[PDB]
Design a protein around this ligand. Structure first.
Ligand SMILES: O=C(CCCCCCC(=O)Nc1ccccc1)NO
Ligand SMILES: [K+]
Ligand SMILES: [K+]
Ligand SMILES: [Zn+2]
Length: 397
């Protein structure tokens, strides 16, 4: 069974931010226009018995002082009066400024993604769903006491923490254009949560990590060799990104044998994203790199959490996430999900113009990374006393 996080209030909150606007409504209404909703189990966002219970849940990762500053930021932004000099200093000390500004629903908006991803982790734990999708989540940059790249609360870390605390090993796969720094850092010292981020990295490109350090860092203490990274040069197409990631994913699965897989599916790798870095598509016959990776992960038959993330071309993010959703139903249930290449009529139909089609409107260094990663995987397996066939893994690359 495939679950999807949705709710009336959830949709209102996920649509309340200045950066992501109505993106979540476009994604959910396109999935609905394509008649996918009757094939999915609605997973309600988690709600708490009291403010103390909510604080206990969020503070499993975030500091109380940061959560307090985030809630104060919402309160201050619900008042006409400008912030005092003292409050400006307090907010800057948590990086609650710049690409992480305040807005009237900043706390409710941030908390909603945590509510959705924690409920999605619970549905996997109780075996109600084999896979759960949360297009309102995937806020990979948020740190313990710091907002970063429009991520205020780290719903991923919190969902993984719920999964690990459920012998349990979690594999985290981050497909976003940006390095999954917040998640990687949270589990830097933990061998039980293996993190893998594929992303662009170049001088001055956000956040600056997931690449050669001035050496390639990969975790510390008992978590040494547990944080995997594949930085890629700009312009990579569906096929080359699929071949660069494919052997890594299969190798991680074979060696780690994860109990759960958590996938961040940021849509900013799309050729049509305004970042204009990678040339990935949502094409499903070249085959979308996203659809290739998700199909591979799903073939493992491991309980999986699929989350959103980046994606600044709202109708193109909806086009991709609708295809990921339909593919998830197909792979899990074995039921063919035929999707018309024409966008069906609905509320947001006008946003898919002027052509109104489902396909997005688009027409060696890796070998050295593969050898380095294989060696890191062997090192991780030896440190963690894991049994694996080296020849079976080496042959994958
Ligand atoms: O996508 C991110 C965050 C990256 C840094 C935050 C800036 C996001 C942004 O505003 N991107 C953009 C939007 C419109 C046009 C061009 C770039 N993390 O995964
Ligand atoms: K990534
Ligand atoms: K780790
Ligand atoms: Zn991104």
């Amino acid at each position: 069974s495939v679950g999807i996080v949705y709710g009336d209030q959830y949709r209102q909150l996920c649509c309340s931010s200045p950066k992501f606007g109505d993106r979540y409504a476009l994604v959910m209404d396109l999935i609905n226009a394509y008649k996918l909703i009757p094939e999915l189990s609605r997973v309600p966002p988690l709600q708490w018995d009291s403010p103390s219970r909510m604080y206990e849940a969020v503070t499993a990762f975030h500091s109380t002082e940061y959560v307090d500053a985030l809630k104060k930021l919402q309160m201050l932004h619900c008042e006409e009066k400008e912030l005092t000099a003292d409050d400006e200093l307090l907010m800057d000390s948590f990086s609650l400024n710049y690409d992480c500004p305040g807005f009237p629903s900043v706390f409710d908006y941030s908390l909603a993604a945590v509510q959705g991803s924690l409920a999605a982790a619970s549905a996997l734990i109780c075996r109600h769903c084999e896979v759960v999708i949360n297009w309102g989540g995937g806020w990979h940059h948020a740190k313990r006491s710091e907002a970063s790249g429009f991520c205020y609360l780290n719903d991923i870390v919190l969902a993984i923490h719920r999964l690990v605390s459920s012998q349990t090993r979690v594999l985290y796969v981050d497909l976003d254009l940006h390095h999954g720094d917040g998640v990687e850092e949270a589990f830097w010292y933990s061998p039980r949560v293996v993190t893998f981020s594929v992303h662009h990295a170049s001088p001055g490109f956000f956040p600056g990590t997931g690449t050669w350090n001035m050496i390639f860092l990969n975790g510390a203490g008992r978590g040494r060799f547990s944080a995997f990274n594949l930085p890629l040069e700009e312009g990579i197409n569906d096929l080359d990104w699929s071949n660069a990631i494919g052997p890594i994913l299969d190798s991680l699965n074979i060696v780690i044998q994860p109990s759960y897989v958590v996938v961040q599916c940021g849509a900013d790798c799309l050729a049509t994203d305004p970042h204009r870095i990678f040339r990935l598509t949502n094409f499903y016959p070249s085959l979308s790199g996203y659809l290739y990776a998700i199909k591979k992960i799903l073939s493992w038959k491991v309980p999986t959490l699929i989350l959103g993330g980046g994606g600044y071309n709202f109708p193109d993010t909806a086009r991709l996430w609708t295809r990921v959703t339909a593919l998830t139903i197909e792979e899990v249930k074995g039921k063919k999900m035929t999707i018309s290449p024409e966008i069906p009529e609905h509320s947001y139909f006008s946003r898919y113009g002027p052509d109104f089609e489902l396909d997005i409107d688009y027409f060696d260094s890796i070998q050295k990374h593969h050898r380095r990663i294989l060696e890191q995987l062997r090192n991780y397996a030896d440190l963690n006393k894991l049994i694996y066939d080296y020849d079976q893994v080496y042959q994958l690359y």
